[PDB]
């Protein structure tokens, strides 16, 4: 008999080509969400600094009424 190592009846195909999923929410939508999150941070910054100026005027009233 013959007992080499033969290819056993043919072998299935091996993938042989590039494959790129290329996703990632192309520049329109992600550009938009970047500017939108930036605007959200701006508006919260505006509100908090106005409240902070209120508090700073109260501390000014403290130093004024203390002084004499």
């Amino acid at each position: 008999v013959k007992q080499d190592m033969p290819p056993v009846g043919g072998y299935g195909p091996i993938d042989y080509k590039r494959n790129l999923p290329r996703r990632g929410l192309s520049g329109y939508s992600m550009f938009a969400v970047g500017i939108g999150a930036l605007l959200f941070g701006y508006w919260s910054m505006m509100r908090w600094n106005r409240e902070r100026r209120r508090l700073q005027i109260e501390d000014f009233e403290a130093r004024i009424a203390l002084m004499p």
Binding site: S26, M30, F31
Partner: protein
């Protein structure tokens, strides 16, 4: 038969140029490379402890 590389230009469609400019100004495919190497971070490492497990051989 010859299957050659890079005979193509980035076409001047507005969506093509804004996606390439978003690649530039927002470092996107760089972050895709970061995601690739983190995918190899969470793998199980292919090492062998030598002085207790010697490496494989042949007859």
């Amino acid at each position: 038969t010859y299957k050659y590389v890079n005979l193509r230009e980035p076409s001047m469609d507005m969506k093509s140029v804004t996606d390439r400019a978003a690649q530039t100004l927002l470092w996107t495919e760089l972050i895709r490379g970061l995601g690739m190497t983190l995918s190899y971070l969470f793998r199980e490492p292919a090492t062998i402890n030598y002085p207790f497990e010697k490496g494989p051989l042949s007859p």
